[PDB]
Amino acid sequence: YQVMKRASEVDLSTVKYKAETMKAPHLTGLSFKLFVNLLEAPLIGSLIVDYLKKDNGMTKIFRNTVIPEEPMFRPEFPSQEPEHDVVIVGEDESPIDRLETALKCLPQYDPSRSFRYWKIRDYAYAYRSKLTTPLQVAKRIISIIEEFGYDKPPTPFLIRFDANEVIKQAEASTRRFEQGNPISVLDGIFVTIKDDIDCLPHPTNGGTTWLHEDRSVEKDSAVVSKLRSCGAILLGKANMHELGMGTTGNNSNYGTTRNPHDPKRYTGGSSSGSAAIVAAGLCSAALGTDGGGSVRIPSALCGITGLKTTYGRTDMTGSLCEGGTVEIIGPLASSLEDAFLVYAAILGSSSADRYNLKPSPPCFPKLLSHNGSNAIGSLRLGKYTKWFNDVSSSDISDKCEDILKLLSNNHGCKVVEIVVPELEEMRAAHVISIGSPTLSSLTPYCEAGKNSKLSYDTRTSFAIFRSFSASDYIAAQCLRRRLMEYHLNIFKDVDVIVTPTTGMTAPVIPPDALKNGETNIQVTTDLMRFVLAANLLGFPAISVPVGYDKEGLPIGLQIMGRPWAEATVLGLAAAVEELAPVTKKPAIFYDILN
Amino acid sequence: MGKYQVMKRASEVDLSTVKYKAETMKAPHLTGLSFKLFVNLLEAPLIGSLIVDYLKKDNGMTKIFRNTVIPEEPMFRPEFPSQEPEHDVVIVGEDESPIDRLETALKCLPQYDPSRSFRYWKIRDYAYAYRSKLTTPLQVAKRIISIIEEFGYDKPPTPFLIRFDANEVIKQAEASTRRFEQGNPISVLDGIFVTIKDDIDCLPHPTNGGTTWLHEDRSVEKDSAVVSKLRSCGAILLGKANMHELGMGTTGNNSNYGTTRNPHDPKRYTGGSSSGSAAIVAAGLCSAALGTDGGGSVRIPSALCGITGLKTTYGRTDMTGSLCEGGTVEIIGPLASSLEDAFLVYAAILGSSSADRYNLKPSPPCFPKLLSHNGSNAIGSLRLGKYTKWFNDVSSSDISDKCEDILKLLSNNHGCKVVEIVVPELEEMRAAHVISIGSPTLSSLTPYCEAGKNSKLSYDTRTSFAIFRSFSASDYIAAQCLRRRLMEYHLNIFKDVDVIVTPTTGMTAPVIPPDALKNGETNIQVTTDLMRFVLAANLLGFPAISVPVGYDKEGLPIGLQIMGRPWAEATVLGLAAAVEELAPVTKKPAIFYDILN
């Protein structure tokens, strides 16, 4: 008749791992479009959705279960014990000043590195040694984009690109290097911006064709304004899975961005273009949003570093997901050092988040690791083995287990077996928590006739989101509190939680799916198996490359840490990067700086 | 923006162009068989959704939730900035016991003068009678028990209480009597009788929230936080009060147990949803009662019944052990027959849960100095915000006249300045409130209703639940963005004024339509007038109090509402004490019982 729970009294020894995959048929092309027309049909559409929610257990969770916890509408963090062996940064420092402090946290630059990706400090040294100039690098990047059509269908990196704007900024940066006063280590560094983040002079479409018609861009987002103040060069707007409602990167409007390691495979989503352009070496870094693993997933599949920061750590003003409760804006880069430097530039809460969320002052890790590494070795690594191993290929669990052994051997890290209850409830709570504000912010435009302009993938999701009731939303926030309590208790015993980033490597794109998208829940299920807690509960998490599977496809490891502990997850990731450097040059790669 | 889709913003709105909008709520009144058939249509598989979608389209809620771009981010719970500390108050510790706070509260009152032993009795009158052995708590209990059993106030068709155990009451009164004879009373509340609304847990009674069945699915093994605090002071818990079912109504109509009647006129509603709580106090049977307020459910009946009802800041008083814990608009507050009594009960029950303490970060509780004059230099410094078009939008001009007279008396006797203010987007506030109160109420009851117990609810509640079930999750997000807008407006108002003053209700106690007694009614234009002024305090969390200020042309009580800054209960209580000085409750209700005689 009805079931009941309670979180603080749950016997953790009785918690069982729930392994059943959400099952649904894979649809592409005409069958997919007919299915969406059925979903949007006045009467039978609701009937279908109600059957889907009853079959996957969401109705039992939202409507047939007594939940004793009060709702947690946004991540609520208790005071955390201060991090160990970190540098405390002022809360109201400028990005320029934070970059000066960030350089002091890195090992001394050795001009012997100028396969290995180029680093931000390699560019910065080349600009200052007049070995090259930002204008020349810009011409080289502009040449490659125009030659291969990376700003055009059918496989673009960028869906908004103004070569004159890029030349304009690069000339101003070159002039500052010629005059001998660069703004910072980021002066002249090229950064790509995901199309759900505002970046002048470009419009923001979120991967749609039409959003610019209804939402204009008057000023830079907070993250872009901070990068621009450092002298960084904004390259353009990156392709993405439409409005963040996907984890593959499939885009019917502009074409699907291809994985540089294998152009027949997906990049991962939704920050598809951002990850690909960095993996190909065209630009140093990119910014992306992560609401459902949207930064970490494509970073893992494309073999780069993606950092998901604590909820509210980085001001999201000027983006399509501002006001959301699961999303962040984070960096993607081809090395830990580069991702750390971009984080130093963009971090900083909005004024409202500063009072509401009460973050501890940002901290930087000491990556020069001497005196070291007593800090890394004292870290306790939580492993949920049944969860850790639930992957499609043993290559993934093998490669990530090897990294844990390497950390124990070289530093002394202790791996602690943990249990994470109610992963099924977490997925249900996350989908309605990310989908309700996304649908809500677009509902006036869609009610005004623009719903048919969306892709069939988005329209499938929106048909599901429209069936979520307000009372469903309340119940899901009560589940958020349950999962927060479970994770905070785990964080009493361990410092981080380690998993593979994804349950599969880069999947091949079904050719029939390029025409008008697809629905393939079994693929989206494997891709989101490990990432959702960082979003529903707000913890920071990073994806760091740790090798390749039998077919040479990159494998990612996820380190999720305590609230506001980016410095901890960054330092542990730097130790992982020491033990597992990225060695394979991607099939699609460009050696700028030559 | 009047065309394809509508747009807004808040911090850039020119306050001088904001026009007051009239009641854009239109509906027909239904009772009895017409009502039942309408609920069956609303619950019909296909036509029900069509009717609700039409109703939401017609009252403007669809335009607000789905056709309007809202630029503010959501505010999911009231978010209060740091406030300026109150003037001329006594700070009480954050972790003091209710016994200790009562001792501090007594020092804030004028010295007790036994020269007064019409006027209701006061808690200190009882306390002096117990201590001077004029009477005993056992005598008072037997007198109260006698009246209840004689008039059937614990049974249909017009009960005050829906759970009553006379033996439990006697039991408690004997133990209190023992402590008075032994010469060690616990506090000024030892022996004082308090009624508990039926959505608050109070041993040994079950909690039904005015339903017939909720006890089957939700047991009560512990006192609520508020009852545990009262019980530690020696107060006598009289029983569970009647209420509008599950707090989903503002009249007090209850088809399950019978409708509690207004003691000033037994043919009229008490107001809701704290119907029983208010009536029993107005009749003088007990000193005070606890209720919940989520949509004015404490203030409305308090006003209609001519008593004082205090709605405290969101999170000020721990709600653990009640049907509305975890909600975002509700509080538990006291109802008493004088400001002094309400102040003493507030002192006992206050204090946040640990979760609310950390999330809401309340400033430590403060008590007003009612000594007082002067004293009244602090009262005269208060700036009183008045939104005139809103203030006067009442059904009977007696209400605006009587409330305006109080403002003039405050200006002339204390020097208070009345400042003209504007409250924009009152229509958006009603829409945001309805979905914010309805969604958690429906959510916490959905597993029982899905289990087949939805038909056991009243047709009134089932009408609301059919509407709440049409609210989407995206609608809920949009409503929380409206909450932030209205919070900004009101916080800006509280830069220029210290309190916002309105009538408590837009009408006095309405007559119960006889056909509405069998299975309830739907009467939106009555609920509209009753909720006109009380929403902000719930949606935004501000404290507000209803104080009696006189009577209309038919002798029905009129209430004035004073809404203050977050955590400013002391300011609100102090100003209400000054209003009570200038407008004492003079009329004895038609239904009144003189205990202590």
From Swiss-Prot, chain A:
Activity regulation as described: Inhibited by methyl arachidonyl fluorophosphonate (MAFP).
Protein location: Endoplasmic reticulum membrane; Cell membrane
GO MF entries: fatty acid amide hydrolase activity; N-(long-chain-acyl)ethanolamine deacylase activity
Major location category of this protein: endoplasmic reticulum
Top-level taxon of origin: Eukaryota
Assigned EC number: 3.5.1.99
Pfam assignment, any one: Amidase
GO biological process, one term: defense response to bacterium
Binding site for substrate: G291, G292, G293, S294
Reported phenotype of the disruption mutant: No visible phenotype under normal growth conditions. Enhanced sensitivity to inhibition of seedling growth induced by exogenous N-acylethanolamine.
Positions annotated as active site in the UniProt record: K194, S270, S294
Catalysed reactions, as listed in the record: N-(5Z,8Z,11Z,14Z-eicosatetraenoyl)-ethanolamine + H2O = ethanolamine + (5Z,8Z,11Z,14Z)-eicosatetraenoate; N-(9Z,12Z-octadecadienoyl)-ethanolamine + H2O = ethanolamine + (9Z,12Z)-octadecadienoate; N-hexadecanoylethanolamine + H2O = ethanolamine + hexadecanoate; N-tetradecanoylethanolamine + H2O = tetradecanoate + ethanolamine
GO cellular component: endoplasmic reticulum; endoplasmic reticulum membrane; Golgi apparatus; plant-type vacuole; plasma membrane; plastid
Family, per entry: Belongs to the amidase family.
Protein name according to UniProt: Fatty acid amide hydrolase
UniProt organism field: Arabidopsis thaliana
Gene: FAAH
